[PDB]
Amino acid sequence: PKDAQMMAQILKDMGITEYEPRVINQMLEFAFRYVTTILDDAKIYSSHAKKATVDADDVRLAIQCRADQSFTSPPPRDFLLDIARQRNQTPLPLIKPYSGPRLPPDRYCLTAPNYRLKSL
Amino acid sequence: KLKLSNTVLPSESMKVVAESMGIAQIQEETCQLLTDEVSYRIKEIAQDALKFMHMGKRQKLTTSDIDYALKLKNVEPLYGFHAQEFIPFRFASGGGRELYFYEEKEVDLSDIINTPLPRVPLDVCLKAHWLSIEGCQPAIPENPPRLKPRSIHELSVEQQLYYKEITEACVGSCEAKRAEALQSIATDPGLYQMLPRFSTFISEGVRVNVVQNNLALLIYLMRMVKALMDNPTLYLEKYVHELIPAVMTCIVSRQLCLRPDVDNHWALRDFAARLVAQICKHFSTTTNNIQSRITKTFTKSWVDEKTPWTTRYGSIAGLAELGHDVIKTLILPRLQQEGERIRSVLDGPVLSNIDRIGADHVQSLLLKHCAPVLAKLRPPPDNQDAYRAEFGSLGPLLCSQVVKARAQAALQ
Amino acid sequence: DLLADENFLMVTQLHWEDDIIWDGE
Amino acid sequence: HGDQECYYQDDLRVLSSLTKKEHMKGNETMLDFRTSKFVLRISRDSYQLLKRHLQEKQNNQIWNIVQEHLYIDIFDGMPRSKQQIDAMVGSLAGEAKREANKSKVFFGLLKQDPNAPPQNRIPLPELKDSDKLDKIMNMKETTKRVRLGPDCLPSICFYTFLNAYQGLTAVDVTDDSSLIAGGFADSTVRVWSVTPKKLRSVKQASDLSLIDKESDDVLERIMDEKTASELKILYGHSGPVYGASFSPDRNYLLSSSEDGTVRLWSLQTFTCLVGYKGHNYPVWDTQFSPYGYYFVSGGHDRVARLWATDHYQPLRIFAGHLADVNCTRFHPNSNYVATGSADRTVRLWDVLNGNCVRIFTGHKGPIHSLTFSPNGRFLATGATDGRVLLWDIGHGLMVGELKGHTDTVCSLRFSRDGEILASGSMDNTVRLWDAIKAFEDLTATGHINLPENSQELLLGTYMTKSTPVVHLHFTRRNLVLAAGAYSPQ
Amino acid sequence: NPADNYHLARRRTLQVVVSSLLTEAGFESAEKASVETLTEMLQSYISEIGRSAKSYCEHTARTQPTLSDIVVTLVEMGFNVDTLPAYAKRSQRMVITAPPVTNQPVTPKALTAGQNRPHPPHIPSHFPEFPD
Amino acid sequence: TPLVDFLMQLEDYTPTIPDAVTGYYLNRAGFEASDPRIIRLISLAAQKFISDIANDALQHCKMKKYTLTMEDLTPALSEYGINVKKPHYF
């Protein structure tokens, strides 16, 4: 196909030699889902600005307002290094010698009487 | 040298999607703006789905890797639908859509119900074996592969012994042993470099085992041949020049032992031999050497006047099991001769010879082959007395066999 | 092409039909 | 792009995708590459030619980019060869300063060793009488332990997972070869007993209330024989289990998965106890401490957390990597945590103060295996380039490069004596390396001339039948165990 | 074949369930893409009560979910649980059996008789016999 | 307790989806089969969701019975807030 032969070149440019045949079919299904939610929001933004033609600033708005919600990322390095030094300053606690099975408080564990219904 | 490029999706696919949605009259710079954004998100996910491939220790990107790569980028793994509320399915993968390019795009709703469900495979188990014994890798099936000096045999002293245990088990004193040996022959990876001695033991055995027609000795050797053939590791067509005249002798030879009673096994000796014979013509095939040579010997066994009827029955079976077209092109012009032979056995009173038994077996086999040869190339009309134009051998019973074949086809 | 390995395998170079034992005695 | 070194193709492809600004504003690896400084260790004999070509106004713009984005760490010595520079570069913001690799590291074992830390440095747990009973039968195994060396090559017992149509993603074996855990892609952990002794759960609380304590049998009395299998399946992860780690007292299985939780499974009740939710992202590895109280888990969020099995929150956050923390390994004294990662760096982290005390660069792919020497002096790391790099820990210098493997080296272990390093990779081979001849020599140039001696350090290579070697384990009698799902592919 | 079958047996049963519910509705012969759509929403629905009712019970420090954890899970998906006793007692309903399971004599594994060499003392008895 | 009564009746009830298949997708998400009746209620809830979508789609087909097309699933899931996607790339 046309758009499915370009999908095998996006993977081969990323060095993916081996892949399942259902991999191309659902990256096209995601790429179709992504462009019919940019352009669906683009004509919502065009009707907000009251213009009959969806021009390039509408797609510039609908991309950056969908990328502000959908595609997130891990936390940044200046945020990870601040919560590290706030946590790594606290000294390590000592251990009680014969406390038993060392566990968190019981509202943080998964150890409850764990009931079930009576069969009748 | 690296001529790496940046391949994006085509823009002429993005205008088709836009005008099939209600957004008409889009500019080219508007349309190029769509195809570099979505081609980045495909590149961002396929680079992120390659993290799950490496972590799962696979070299193939499965369909579930993109489901976790999407969930990692806070996008729902759902592909077919998108739920604005997101509450019915929250980042839950539905496994994609089983769709094709060459699909029918319309099915009947009772076709999907009546098909049999695939078999759930075996659960995960833990078996242990040996990669290395003090530095040396064993050849188990869980592993992949002036006086001149006194020479050594190319087998270990121990190596000679298995040759000895497997051959003394394959002469079938005990049936579970026979099998233990059989199991070994069919899947030992290191059974090459012992294969000349196995081929010579087979060949030499059948020839001094037809001097007195010892049926078990022969049935065990034919099972040894069948166990040699389905082993995938060893290279057999260097030794098939010894293997093939041994099986032809099992099929085309007279029986020196009691003529009746074990003739039932004799038919199987010719059944096992004709099976391995057509399996040998299926493999090892080059131009005009193996299959045509055994076909020519079978046909001149057939057209030979006044044959031994054991040899006749064996050659008939051998030419019978050669496939679809071979009986379509060879058994056709010969029905009258078969009928005349049957009539001669019937007329002559002589009953204490093996001629009558040979005749009955040959006629039954020929009639079954003729039945599908007919079921295969014509409609089942006039199944009562039209077969009387073919000397009336199988007639209505042949028609009943064709009807049973049609019922099996309906069941399929 | 006549130097191909198969040409020299003895199935393609031996009249092994003569070996088949018919009515031996 | 095509005059760049061949080892940089992956980064070059990520960059070829990046063409917009907003594409790079949400990458967070090139966002941290743009703000950091490339370290670029160069000699003073070559820096004089560089600074005589940059201090002139003819090239004051590329000199302005160099002194803005690049550190330059100068050493006084010989200029390195091309096959020595190729051995130690490959990372992003790579080839770190020698001032990072000069901190004092207590790389010795606990109990005199001057390199050993005190026992009260890290508050390690007590040694109980059942834990002291374990070391009594451990030294009976050490009595039968063979000296391996380059002559008495060990026997390898491969524990293959035969069907495994759910993809096996994590293996661990206990310290005595008694249990084998399997983390699978169908969100399950499966414990197998390999000794002829079935897996039993302890009795319920009604059955324990009627028996008495203080008895000699006690543990034997508590076992339930109604529940006795050769296989126990553990459910509760909502995603493929990527890490698996036993505790040294043979209770307390650990597992981490794609759903962002680390789970502590009991091996006496065979239920889940705690779910440690600190990552929102796939936790790629976890490991218990060799003393069994703390554990470290590294995830997709580019940190490694230190937990203690007593707090719902971590104690130390090791947050200096620029990509995913793929591996997390404890030192044999458990005062130091080595975290390999996907930005081609290996970093040692002190458990006190959470400080990075060593940075080991020189891998060309993401590091997928780390192991420590039993001395505590050395560290073997493997990555996707098929290279096993042997690092010193006191000197912070790589001491050797093993380049026999072809694909990703996913499992390393040293022997119990330290005589042999075993390497298992995706080329379905278990290579054995001489881990005594590789460490025969023990600076201020911050580098040593690596020997190119891999051929002499290979004692053997053994090929698996279509089976990637996921785990490598050494029995206490020096017998190699290996586990891998058989994939016909 | 078998790895495809591991996933496919459980997807093909889901597809037959979808085809049967469509027939009960009144549809005979549906479009192909409309069946793989609806059986993808069915697998994503079972997998969402799996992840959310496990989350609601483990929030309450338990490990296996009761009825009170699913009737809060289905409320958070907008189900109106009270209509379910009337749906279960239909007269039009079908039953699809579980797929075939490849089990032979529990496990049909008995290896083969090839044992000769014993064991050196660094290998315990529970490891496999050194091969012949 | 109407639903507690229903779940207690769910023993001796066979649902349209098998428990070997409903229990497979529950084990995939950490839900383990402690009680069969709970698996059966989950199976029936999934069945009701698919059946309700199908019945709405049939009312749309009757308005425009017989064949179910993607243009019947599109307005049927639109009141649910679910925008279904055409394939369009095969």
CSV table of N, CA, C and O in Angstrom, one decimal, chain A residues 1-3 6-7 9-11 13-14 16 18-23 25-27 29-40 43 53-56 59-60 63 66-67 69-72, chain B residues 4-5 7-10 12 17-18 21 23 29-30 33-34 37-38 41-47 50 59-63 66-67 70 73-76 78-79 81-82 95-96 98-99 101:
chain,number,residue,atom,x,y,z
A,1,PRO,N,0.8,-1.2,0.0
A,1,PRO,CA,0.0,0.0,0.0
A,1,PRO,C,0.8,1.3,0.0
A,1,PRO,O,2.1,1.2,0.1
A,2,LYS,N,0.2,2.4,-0.1
A,2,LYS,CA,0.9,3.7,-0.2
A,2,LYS,C,1.4,4.1,1.2
A,2,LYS,O,2.6,4.3,1.4
A,3,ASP,N,0.5,4.3,2.2
A,3,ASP,CA,0.9,4.8,3.5
A,3,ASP,C,1.5,3.7,4.3
A,3,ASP,O,2.2,4.0,5.3
A,6,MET,N,5.4,3.5,3.6
A,6,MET,CA,6.2,4.6,4.3
A,6,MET,C,6.3,4.2,5.7
A,6,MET,O,7.3,4.7,6.4
A,7,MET,N,5.4,3.5,6.3
A,7,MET,CA,5.5,3.1,7.7
A,7,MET,C,6.7,2.0,7.9
A,7,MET,O,7.3,2.0,9.0
A,9,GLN,N,9.4,2.3,6.3
A,9,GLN,CA,10.6,3.0,6.1
A,9,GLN,C,10.9,3.9,7.4
A,9,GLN,O,12.0,4.3,7.6
A,10,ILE,N,9.8,4.3,8.1
A,10,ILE,CA,10.0,5.0,9.4
A,10,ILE,C,10.6,4.0,10.4
A,10,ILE,O,11.5,4.4,11.2
A,11,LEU,N,10.2,2.7,10.4
A,11,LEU,CA,10.8,1.8,11.3
A,11,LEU,C,12.2,1.4,10.9
A,11,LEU,O,13.1,1.2,11.7
A,13,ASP,N,14.3,3.3,9.3
A,13,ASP,CA,15.2,4.5,9.6
A,13,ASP,C,15.5,4.5,11.1
A,13,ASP,O,16.5,5.1,11.5
A,14,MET,N,14.7,3.9,11.9
A,14,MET,CA,15.0,3.7,13.4
A,14,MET,C,15.7,2.4,13.7
A,14,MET,O,15.8,2.1,14.9
A,16,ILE,N,14.8,-0.6,13.2
A,16,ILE,CA,13.9,-1.8,13.6
A,16,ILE,C,13.9,-2.7,12.4
A,16,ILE,O,13.1,-2.5,11.5
A,18,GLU,N,13.4,-6.3,12.7
A,18,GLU,CA,12.4,-7.3,12.9
A,18,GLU,C,11.2,-6.7,13.6
A,18,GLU,O,11.3,-6.1,14.6
A,19,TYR,N,10.0,-6.9,13.0
A,19,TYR,CA,8.8,-6.5,13.6
A,19,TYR,C,7.6,-7.4,13.1
A,19,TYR,O,7.7,-8.1,12.1
A,20,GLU,N,6.6,-7.5,13.9
A,20,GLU,CA,5.4,-8.2,13.6
A,20,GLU,C,4.6,-7.5,12.4
A,20,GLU,O,4.8,-6.3,12.2
A,21,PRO,N,3.9,-8.3,11.6
A,21,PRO,CA,3.1,-7.6,10.6
A,21,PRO,C,1.9,-6.7,11.1
A,21,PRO,O,1.5,-5.9,10.4
A,22,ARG,N,1.5,-7.0,12.3
A,22,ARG,CA,0.4,-6.1,12.9
A,22,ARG,C,1.0,-4.8,13.5
A,22,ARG,O,0.2,-4.0,14.0
A,23,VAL,N,2.3,-4.6,13.4
A,23,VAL,CA,2.9,-3.4,14.0
A,23,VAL,C,2.6,-2.2,13.0
A,23,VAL,O,2.3,-1.1,13.5
A,25,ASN,N,0.1,-2.0,10.9
A,25,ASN,CA,-1.3,-1.8,10.8
A,25,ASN,C,-1.8,-0.9,12.0
A,25,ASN,O,-2.8,-0.2,11.8
A,26,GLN,N,-1.2,-1.0,13.1
A,26,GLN,CA,-1.7,-0.2,14.3
A,26,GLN,C,-0.9,1.1,14.5
A,26,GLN,O,-1.4,1.9,15.3
A,27,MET,N,0.2,1.3,13.9
A,27,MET,CA,0.8,2.6,13.9
A,27,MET,C,0.1,3.5,12.9
A,27,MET,O,0.0,4.7,13.1
A,29,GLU,N,-3.1,3.0,12.4
A,29,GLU,CA,-4.3,3.3,13.1
A,29,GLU,C,-4.2,4.4,14.2
A,29,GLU,O,-5.1,5.1,14.5
A,30,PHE,N,-3.0,4.5,14.7
A,30,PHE,CA,-2.7,5.6,15.7
A,30,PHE,C,-2.5,6.9,14.9
A,30,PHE,O,-2.9,8.0,15.4
A,31,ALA,N,-1.8,6.8,13.8
A,31,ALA,CA,-1.5,8.0,13.0
A,31,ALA,C,-2.8,8.6,12.4
A,31,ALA,O,-3.0,9.8,12.3
A,32,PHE,N,-3.8,7.7,12.0
A,32,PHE,CA,-5.1,8.2,11.6
A,32,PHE,C,-5.9,8.7,12.8
A,32,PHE,O,-6.6,9.7,12.6
A,33,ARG,N,-5.8,8.1,14.0
A,33,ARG,CA,-6.5,8.6,15.2
A,33,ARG,C,-5.9,10.0,15.6
A,33,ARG,O,-6.6,10.8,16.1
A,34,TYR,N,-4.6,10.2,15.4
A,34,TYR,CA,-4.0,11.5,15.8
A,34,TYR,C,-4.3,12.6,14.8
A,34,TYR,O,-4.4,13.8,15.3
A,35,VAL,N,-4.5,12.3,13.5
A,35,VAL,CA,-4.8,13.4,12.6
A,35,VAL,C,-6.2,13.8,12.6
A,35,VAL,O,-6.6,14.9,12.3
A,36,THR,N,-7.1,12.8,12.9
A,36,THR,CA,-8.6,13.1,13.0
A,36,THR,C,-9.0,13.6,14.4
A,36,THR,O,-10.2,13.7,14.6
A,37,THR,N,-8.0,13.9,15.3
A,37,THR,CA,-8.3,14.6,16.5
A,37,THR,C,-7.5,16.0,16.5
A,37,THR,O,-7.9,16.8,17.3
A,38,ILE,N,-6.5,16.2,15.6
A,38,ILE,CA,-6.0,17.5,15.4
A,38,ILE,C,-6.9,18.3,14.6
A,38,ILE,O,-7.3,19.4,14.9
A,39,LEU,N,-7.4,17.7,13.4
A,39,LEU,CA,-8.2,18.4,12.5
A,39,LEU,C,-9.6,18.6,13.0
A,39,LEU,O,-10.3,19.5,12.6
A,40,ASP,N,-10.1,17.7,13.9
A,40,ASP,CA,-11.4,17.8,14.5
A,40,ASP,C,-11.3,19.0,15.5
A,40,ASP,O,-12.3,19.8,15.5
A,43,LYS,N,-11.0,22.6,13.4
A,43,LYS,CA,-12.2,23.3,12.9
A,43,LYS,C,-13.1,23.8,14.1
A,43,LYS,O,-14.0,24.7,13.9
A,53,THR,N,-12.3,28.9,6.4
A,53,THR,CA,-11.2,28.1,6.0
A,53,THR,C,-10.3,27.8,7.2
A,53,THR,O,-9.9,28.7,7.9
A,54,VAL,N,-10.1,26.5,7.4
A,54,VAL,CA,-9.2,26.1,8.4
A,54,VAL,C,-7.8,26.3,7.9
A,54,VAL,O,-7.3,25.5,7.0
A,55,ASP,N,-7.1,27.3,8.3
A,55,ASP,CA,-5.7,27.6,7.8
A,55,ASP,C,-4.7,27.1,8.8
A,55,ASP,O,-5.0,26.4,9.7
A,56,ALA,N,-3.4,27.5,8.5
A,56,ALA,CA,-2.3,26.9,9.2
A,56,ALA,C,-2.2,27.3,10.7
A,56,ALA,O,-1.6,26.5,11.5
A,59,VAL,N,-4.2,24.7,12.8
A,59,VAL,CA,-3.5,23.5,13.0
A,59,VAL,C,-2.3,23.7,13.9
A,59,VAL,O,-1.9,22.8,14.7
A,60,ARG,N,-1.7,24.9,13.9
A,60,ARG,CA,-0.7,25.2,14.9
A,60,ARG,C,-1.2,25.3,16.3
A,60,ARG,O,-0.5,25.0,17.3
A,63,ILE,N,-2.3,21.5,17.4
A,63,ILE,CA,-1.2,20.7,17.7
A,63,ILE,C,-0.7,20.9,19.1
A,63,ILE,O,-0.5,20.0,19.9
A,66,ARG,N,-3.0,19.9,21.9
A,66,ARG,CA,-3.2,18.5,22.1
A,66,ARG,C,-1.9,17.9,22.6
A,66,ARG,O,-1.9,16.9,23.4
A,67,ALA,N,-0.7,18.5,22.3
A,67,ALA,CA,0.6,18.1,22.8
A,67,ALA,C,0.8,18.6,24.3
A,67,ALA,O,1.7,18.1,24.9
A,69,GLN,N,-1.6,18.2,26.5
A,69,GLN,CA,-2.3,17.2,27.3
A,69,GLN,C,-2.0,15.8,27.1
A,69,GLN,O,-1.9,15.0,28.0
A,70,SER,N,-1.7,15.4,25.8
A,70,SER,CA,-1.6,14.0,25.5
A,70,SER,C,-0.2,13.5,25.8
A,70,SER,O,0.0,12.6,26.7
A,71,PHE,N,0.8,14.0,25.1
A,71,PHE,CA,2.2,13.5,25.1
A,71,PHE,C,2.9,14.1,26.2
A,71,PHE,O,3.5,15.2,26.1
A,72,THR,N,3.0,13.4,27.4
A,72,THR,CA,3.8,13.9,28.5
A,72,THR,C,5.2,13.3,28.5
A,72,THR,O,5.6,12.6,27.5
B,4,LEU,N,21.9,8.6,6.5
B,4,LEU,CA,20.6,8.5,7.3
B,4,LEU,C,19.7,9.7,6.9
B,4,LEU,O,20.2,10.9,6.9
B,5,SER,N,18.5,9.4,6.7
B,5,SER,CA,17.5,10.5,6.2
B,5,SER,C,16.4,10.6,7.3
B,5,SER,O,16.4,9.9,8.3
B,7,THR,N,12.5,10.3,7.1
B,7,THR,CA,11.3,9.9,6.3
B,7,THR,C,10.1,10.2,7.0
B,7,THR,O,9.9,9.8,8.2
B,8,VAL,N,9.2,11.0,6.4
B,8,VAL,CA,7.9,11.4,7.0
B,8,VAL,C,6.8,10.7,6.1
B,8,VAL,O,7.0,10.3,5.0
B,9,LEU,N,5.6,10.7,6.7
B,9,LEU,CA,4.4,10.3,6.0
B,9,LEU,C,4.1,11.2,4.8
B,9,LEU,O,4.3,12.4,4.9
B,10,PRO,N,3.5,10.7,3.7
B,10,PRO,CA,3.2,11.6,2.6
B,10,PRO,C,2.0,12.5,2.9
B,10,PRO,O,1.1,12.2,3.6
B,12,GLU,N,0.0,13.8,0.6
B,12,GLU,CA,-1.1,13.5,-0.2
B,12,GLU,C,-2.0,12.4,0.4
B,12,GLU,O,-3.1,12.2,-0.1
B,17,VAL,N,-7.5,12.5,4.2
B,17,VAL,CA,-8.1,12.4,5.5
B,17,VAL,C,-8.8,13.6,5.9
B,17,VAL,O,-9.9,13.6,6.5
B,18,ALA,N,-8.3,14.8,5.5
B,18,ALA,CA,-8.9,16.1,5.9
B,18,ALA,C,-10.2,16.3,5.1
B,18,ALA,O,-11.2,16.7,5.7
B,21,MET,N,-13.3,14.4,6.2
B,21,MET,CA,-13.8,14.7,7.5
B,21,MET,C,-14.7,15.9,7.6
B,21,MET,O,-15.3,16.2,8.6
B,23,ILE,N,-13.2,19.1,6.5
B,23,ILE,CA,-12.3,20.2,6.4
B,23,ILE,C,-11.7,20.2,5.0
B,23,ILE,O,-10.8,19.5,4.6
B,29,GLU,N,1.1,24.1,2.9
B,29,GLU,CA,1.8,24.4,4.2
B,29,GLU,C,1.0,24.0,5.4
B,29,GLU,O,1.6,23.6,6.4
B,30,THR,N,-0.3,24.1,5.3
B,30,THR,CA,-1.2,23.5,6.3
B,30,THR,C,-1.1,22.0,6.4
B,30,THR,O,-1.1,21.4,7.4
B,33,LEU,N,2.3,20.7,7.6
B,33,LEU,CA,2.3,20.9,9.0
B,33,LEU,C,1.7,19.7,9.8
B,33,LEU,O,2.1,19.5,10.9
B,34,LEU,N,0.9,18.9,9.1
B,34,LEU,CA,0.3,17.8,9.8
B,34,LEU,C,1.2,16.6,9.7
B,34,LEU,O,1.3,15.8,10.7
B,37,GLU,N,4.3,16.5,12.2
B,37,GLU,CA,3.9,16.3,13.6
B,37,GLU,C,3.6,14.9,13.9
B,37,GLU,O,4.1,14.3,14.9
B,38,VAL,N,2.9,14.2,13.0
B,38,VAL,CA,2.5,12.9,13.3
B,38,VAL,C,3.6,11.9,12.9
B,38,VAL,O,3.7,10.8,13.6
B,41,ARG,N,5.6,11.7,16.1
B,41,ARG,CA,5.0,10.9,17.1
B,41,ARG,C,5.1,9.4,16.8
B,41,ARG,O,5.1,8.6,17.8
B,42,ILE,N,5.1,9.0,15.6
B,42,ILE,CA,5.4,7.6,15.2
B,42,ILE,C,6.9,7.3,15.5
B,42,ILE,O,7.2,6.2,16.0
B,43,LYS,N,7.8,8.2,15.2
B,43,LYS,CA,9.2,8.0,15.5
B,43,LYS,C,9.4,8.1,17.0
B,43,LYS,O,10.4,7.4,17.5
B,44,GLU,N,8.7,8.9,17.8
B,44,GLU,CA,8.8,9.0,19.2
B,44,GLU,C,8.4,7.7,19.9
B,44,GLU,O,8.9,7.3,20.9
B,45,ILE,N,7.3,7.1,19.3
B,45,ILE,CA,6.8,5.9,20.0
B,45,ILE,C,7.6,4.6,19.6
B,45,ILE,O,7.9,3.8,20.4
B,46,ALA,N,8.0,4.5,18.3
B,46,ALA,CA,8.8,3.4,17.9
B,46,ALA,C,10.2,3.4,18.5
B,46,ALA,O,10.7,2.3,18.7
B,47,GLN,N,10.7,4.5,18.8
B,47,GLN,CA,11.9,4.6,19.6
B,47,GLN,C,11.6,4.2,21.1
B,47,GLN,O,12.5,3.7,21.8
B,50,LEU,N,10.9,0.4,21.4
B,50,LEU,CA,12.1,-0.4,21.3
B,50,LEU,C,12.8,-0.6,22.7
B,50,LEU,O,13.6,-1.4,22.9
B,59,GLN,N,13.9,-9.9,20.2
B,59,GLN,CA,14.5,-9.1,19.0
B,59,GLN,C,13.4,-8.7,18.1
B,59,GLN,O,13.7,-8.1,17.0
B,60,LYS,N,12.1,-9.1,18.4
B,60,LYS,CA,11.0,-8.8,17.5
B,60,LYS,C,10.1,-7.8,18.3
B,60,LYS,O,9.6,-8.2,19.4
B,61,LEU,N,9.8,-6.6,17.7
B,61,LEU,CA,8.8,-5.7,18.3
B,61,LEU,C,7.4,-6.3,18.2
B,61,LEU,O,6.9,-6.4,17.1
B,62,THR,N,6.9,-6.8,19.3
B,62,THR,CA,5.5,-7.3,19.2
B,62,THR,C,4.5,-6.2,19.2
B,62,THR,O,4.8,-5.0,19.4
B,63,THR,N,3.2,-6.6,19.0
B,63,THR,CA,2.1,-5.7,19.0
B,63,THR,C,1.8,-5.0,20.3
B,63,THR,O,1.3,-3.9,20.4
B,66,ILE,N,3.9,-1.5,21.5
B,66,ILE,CA,3.3,-0.2,21.2
B,66,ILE,C,2.2,0.2,22.1
B,66,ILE,O,1.9,1.3,22.4
B,67,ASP,N,1.6,-0.9,22.7
B,67,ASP,CA,0.5,-0.6,23.7
B,67,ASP,C,1.1,0.0,25.0
B,67,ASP,O,0.5,0.8,25.7
B,70,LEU,N,2.6,3.6,24.2
B,70,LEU,CA,1.6,4.6,24.1
B,70,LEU,C,1.2,5.0,25.5
B,70,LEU,O,1.0,6.2,25.8
B,73,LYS,N,3.6,7.4,27.2
B,73,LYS,CA,3.4,8.7,26.7
B,73,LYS,C,2.1,9.3,27.1
B,73,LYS,O,1.7,10.3,26.4
B,74,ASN,N,1.3,8.7,28.0
B,74,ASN,CA,0.0,9.2,28.5
B,74,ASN,C,-1.0,9.3,27.4
B,74,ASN,O,-1.9,10.1,27.5
B,75,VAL,N,-0.9,8.5,26.4
B,75,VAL,CA,-1.9,8.4,25.3
B,75,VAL,C,-2.5,7.0,25.5
B,75,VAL,O,-1.8,6.0,25.7
B,76,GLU,N,-3.8,6.9,25.3
B,76,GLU,CA,-4.5,5.6,25.5
B,76,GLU,C,-4.1,4.6,24.4
B,76,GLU,O,-4.0,5.0,23.3
B,78,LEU,N,-5.8,2.4,23.1
B,78,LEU,CA,-6.9,2.1,22.2
B,78,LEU,C,-6.6,2.7,20.8
B,78,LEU,O,-6.2,3.8,20.8
B,79,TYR,N,-6.8,1.9,19.8
B,79,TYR,CA,-6.5,2.4,18.4
B,79,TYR,C,-7.8,2.6,17.6
B,79,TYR,O,-7.9,3.6,16.9
B,81,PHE,N,-10.9,3.1,18.7
B,81,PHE,CA,-11.9,4.2,19.1
B,81,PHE,C,-11.2,5.2,20.1
B,81,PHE,O,-10.1,4.8,20.6
B,82,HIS,N,-11.7,6.3,20.3
B,82,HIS,CA,-11.2,7.2,21.3
B,82,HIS,C,-12.3,7.8,22.2
B,82,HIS,O,-13.3,8.4,21.7
B,95,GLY,N,-5.8,-4.8,22.7
B,95,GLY,CA,-5.1,-5.7,21.8
B,95,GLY,C,-5.1,-5.4,20.3
B,95,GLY,O,-4.7,-6.3,19.5
B,96,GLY,N,-5.5,-4.2,19.9
B,96,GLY,CA,-5.5,-3.8,18.6
B,96,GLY,C,-6.6,-4.4,17.8
B,96,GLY,O,-7.5,-5.0,18.3
B,98,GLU,N,-7.5,-6.9,14.5
B,98,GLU,CA,-7.1,-7.9,13.6
B,98,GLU,C,-7.6,-7.5,12.2
B,98,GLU,O,-8.7,-8.0,11.8
B,99,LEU,N,-7.0,-6.7,11.5
B,99,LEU,CA,-7.4,-6.2,10.2
B,99,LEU,C,-6.2,-6.4,9.2
B,99,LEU,O,-5.1,-6.4,9.5
B,101,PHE,N,-4.9,-5.8,4.8
B,101,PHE,CA,-5.0,-5.1,3.5
B,101,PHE,C,-5.8,-5.9,2.5
B,101,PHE,O,-6.6,-5.3,1.8
